[PDB]
Every structure is written in C-alpha cells, then in structure tokens.
C-alpha cells in the first residue's frame, strides 16, 4: 500500500505533465482519488446539450487523450455524469440513459477511430447520482455534466 | 481466515436465498443467477427483456422486472446493471455500435426500476461492457446468444 502512493503520484504527474506539453488546461483537469488517476472533462468540450454524439470539433482532444492513453497498460472506466434536470426525448428517455450513452460513445471513439483495445474498457452510467456538489443553482449543474475518464488501479 | 470463509458463507446464503426466489416464483426459464468476485448475480438473456437491437424495455418484460424489484427490495447492497453484446459486429443509427447498445440496455432496466418500480436511484450504477465479458467465448452460435444478456449485480 505505501509504494501505491507513489506509482498513483508518479502517474498523476505524468498525466498533469501531458495535460501541460499539450496545452490542454482549458479542456481537461486530472485528479487523483481511490479509483486511480482520472481525467475530468466538462461537457462542453464533448457534447451538445442533452445529446451522446462526440462533435466533430472534440475529436482533436479525444485523439490527445488515446495517445496518453496508449503509453500506459491500465484499464479504463469511463463514467458518464448528468445534472438532474429532466431534458429527457425519444432517444435519451431519462438521465440513465443520456450518461450511459455518452460513456458509451467516447469509449467507441476510442476503439473504433483510435484502435485501443476494447478489453481495456468499462462504459460506466451515474445519472445525477454523482453531483460534484449538489443541483441548487446553475453553477453547480453545469459542473455535474461531464464524462469522468478513470485510469483504474 | 474465517474472516474468508464468513464472507463467502454469507455469500453462499444469499445465493441460496436468491436461487429459492427464483424456484418459488417460478421464474427458472426466464433468469439464472450465480455469484462470483462481484457479488450474487441475476443473469437474464436479451430476449426476456428487449426485441432484437433495441434497448427499449419490453412490456412483458414488466411482470418479471417487478419481481426481480420485490426481491431487491429486501437487500440493502448497492445494484450494479450491466449489458453485455456478443462480438458480433452490428449498428444501427441509434445504437452506433455493441458499447452504445449495452449501455443503453443497462441503462433501460435501471429507468424501469427507478421510475417504475420506485427503488432509489442511488442505489444503481449502469454498466456496458460491449462483447468484452462473454460468459464462455464467441465460438458458437450457442455461446453468441448466452452471451447476449443483462447481468444485475448484488454488490458485496
């Protein structure tokens, strides 16, 4: 456990090093919790508003976080995060369904376009489950959309 | 080491309970369950629950996943839902691909659960694992369809 200290540390700092070369800090942060190193990615720099389909103009980040992604052999838990407004329609019925898909569709990226192993993946769905803090003002919804890129332990 | 075996005994026991639902409610031809390192696992084929492709929960489907919830309401473990395709490779314009569609079946069973059945939706993680966890292999037609299914996770 102590010398896990120091391989997480080690891997924060070369993600935090990448996200610095790249010139990436306006689109992603990283952090380091219990579930590994993860990668936050508001929904902006994805999505549009209440849709799972990765815009033409964020496959240039996707790509940049496919070759980090390439130079380390951990799994990956990519987690799909909703604020709890209802903007439910026939293709996303609820919360559920709208952060599963948009998980969903950056792991096919991922696969499909950039060719990392599928077997090295998991599509995680929260909904609103998971609030950064809470749902009370605007503010605090926009932060709660986001898709979470976890490099497992 | 009974720390081991007590875990693992109380596992077995949940299992059993599980396995007893299923026997006195009649529901063998329509789930299985198991259990292995995530916890006692309800499996449930693709066609109990959706139509071919799609991940709209079906109406008959409705009776069953009230008993699946009538059960879940007794334990208090987190529940983990998780698709899961065969390797065969399908599309569809809305379901672009195998990781979209089992996200999206996951996804449908906890709405379900959640919005009809009225269980807590904190208690529910969704989960799609595309064609990366077959029960056996893709080698058959047989192992193909086994392998198209949901799996509800009672969390240890």
Redesign the interface.
């Known amino acids: 456990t102590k010398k896990q200290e120091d391989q997480q540390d080690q891997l924060l700092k070369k993600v935090n090093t990448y996200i610095k070369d790249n010139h990436l800090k306006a689109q992603m942060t990283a952090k380091r919790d219990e579930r590994g190193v993860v990668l936050v990615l508001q929904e902006a720099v994805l999505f549009d508003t209440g849709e799972a389909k990765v815009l033409k103009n964020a496959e240039t980040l996707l790509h940049q976080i496919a070759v980090l992604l390439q130079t380390i052999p951990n799994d990956i838990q990519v987690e799909g995060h909703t604020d709890s407004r209802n903007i439910s329609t026939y ?1 996303y ?2 919360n ?2 709208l ?3 948009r ?3 950056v ?2 990226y991922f ?2 376009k950039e060719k990392l192993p ?2 090295r ?9 998971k609030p950064v803090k809470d749902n009370k003002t605007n503010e605090h919804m926009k932060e709660n959309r986001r898709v979470e890129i976890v490099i497992k332990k």
Request: proline share 4%; charged share 15%; glycine share 8%.
């Open positions: 293709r019925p609820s559920w369904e952060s599963a898909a998980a969903s569709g792991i096919q696969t499909s599928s077997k993946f998991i599509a995680v769905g929260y909904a609103d489950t």
